[PDB]
Amino acid sequence: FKNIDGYFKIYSKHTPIIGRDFPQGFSALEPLVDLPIGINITRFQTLLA
């Protein structure tokens, strides 16, 4: 996620990789949504299930 001049950009790629942890083989990221938020972001938090 990035917030240059607003325009929130979300990149992603879903694949069942080897599954130990962060892989070593290279993988690309395909942008999914690019939406102009145009606000002030300073802190970040994640939700659960």
Partner 1 sequence: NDLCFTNVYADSFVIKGNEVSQIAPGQTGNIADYNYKLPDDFTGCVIAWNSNKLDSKHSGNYDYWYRLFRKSKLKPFERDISTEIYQAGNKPCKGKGPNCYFPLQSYGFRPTYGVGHQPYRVVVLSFELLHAPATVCGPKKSTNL
Ligand X SMILES: *[C@@H]1O[C@H](CO)[C@@H](O)[C@H](O)[C@H]1NC(C)=O
Helix (H) or strand (E) run with residue 12 in it: strand 8-12
User: Following CA atoms 28, 38, 43, 33 in sequence, which dihedral angle do they give, to the nearest 10 degrees?
Assistant: -30
Paired residues of 2 in beta bridges: 9
23/38 with CB nearer partner 1: 38
Convert residues 12-41 into a mask of x (bound to ligand X by CB under 6 A) and - (unbound): ----------------------------x-
Find the shortest distance in angstroms from Cβ 37 to ligand X.
13
Question: Does the protein bind partner 1 through residue 6 (CB under 8 A)?
Answer: yes
